[PDB]
Design a protein around this ligand. Structure first.
Ligand code: BHE
Ligand code: 48O
Ligand code: MN
Length: 282
């Protein structure tokens, strides 16, 4: 489907869009920072495809408290103008707040079991996302975005992120050398990455892609975690460690800057971040 006539500033071939950051990976995946995209062009492209975006979030045990702000702020900032399906995984159906949604947006509550250890609650998201990539997501959405719940949206998070497979630069380590990355370093774990390998340290709190690619990632991470469990080892940063192994070996087709995953209490507001889009609740 052809784009309509649009009036916007001409791209400047001989002017970099950012002079302070890397905006494309060495495998030619865009790194998404403010100033790299014209959202009007992208909105047109994705609306003409009638794109539906699923957003998964786990609110298990006491984390149900985070849902109200998460959903209210998602309504202000997440894929506004596009079709959205929220999927709230919880052990407490009745504790999901009644948040008023804009048109073309819906929410499903998916009841799941609560594991005792926070590590297992975090890790079993991979299994649960993979399982539902079959039950619901393949028929209901085009893309999945999988995030932590103890967060709020403060600025635009839109179709600029959508791509077959994306990860997000962890806010603690975007300026770190690979040897300093907290990858799993024990060869006995499936998540093992040697000191001389690694592109980026991706945050477990924000990843996504097409349903097919998210199914692949989440199943791979789950199956890897089950191998580790059988061998009596648990990766240093749990699902995040396995996510990082997967994305090393299967390069993402976009990488999101730390604008998309931030903690202002711990890290402030650096000049390199023109926007703080999705942030930790302090
Ligand atoms: C090196 C510079 C020294 C400073 C390093 C600052 C980042 C530390 O970050 C932790 O990183 C871990 C991996 O190594 C896990 O991803 C953990 O979930 C994360 O904590 C999370 O994200 C943080 C941003 C906070 O929101 C914290 O409350 C979260 O639990
Ligand atoms: C602080 C934390 N710790 N744990 N695990 C965490 O953020 N875990 C990742 C996500 O796992 C989910 N979670 C974790 C523990 C829990 O009791 N309930 C829950 O929903 C939330 O969606 C969290 O955002
Ligand atoms: Mn957390």
């Amino acid at each position: 489907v052809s784009l309509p006539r649009m009036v916007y500033p001409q791209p400047k071939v001989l002017t970099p869009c950012r002079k302070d950051v890397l905006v494309v990976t060495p495998w030619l995946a865009p790194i998404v920072w403010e100033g790299t995209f014209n959202i009007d062009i992208l909105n047109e492209q994705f609306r003409l495809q009638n794109t539906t975006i699923g957003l998964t979030v786990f609110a298990i045990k006491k984390y149900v408290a985070f849902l109200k702000l998460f959903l209210e702020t998602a309504e202000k900032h997440f894929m506004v103008g596009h079709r959205v399906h929220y999927y709230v995984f919880t052990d407490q159906p009745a504790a999901v707040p009644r948040v008023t949604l804009g048109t073309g947006r819906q929410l499903s509550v998916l009841e799941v079991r609560a594991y005792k250890r926070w590590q297992d609650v975090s890790m079993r998201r991979m299994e649960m996302i993979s399982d539902f990539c079959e039950r619901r997501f393949l028929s209901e959405v085009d893309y999945l975005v999988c995030v932590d719940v103890d967060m709020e949206f403060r600025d635009h998070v839109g179709v600029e992120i959508l791509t077959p497979l994306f990860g997000t630069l962890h806010p603690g380590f975007y300026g770190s050398s690979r040897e300093a990355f907290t990858y799993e370093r024990r060869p006995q774990s499936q998540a093992y990455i040697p000191k001389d390998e690694g592109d980026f340290y991706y945050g477990g709190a924000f990843f996504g892609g097409s349903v097919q690619e998210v199914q692949r990632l989440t199943r791979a991470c789950h199956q890897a975690m089950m191998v580790d469990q059988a061998n009596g080892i648990e990766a240093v940063w749990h699902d995040e460690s396995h996510l990082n192994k997967y994305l090393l070996r299967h390069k993402p087709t976009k990488v999101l800057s730390p604008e998309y995953l931030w903690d202002q209490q711990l890290l402030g507001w650096p000049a390199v971040l023109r926007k703080l889009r999705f942030t930790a609740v302090p």
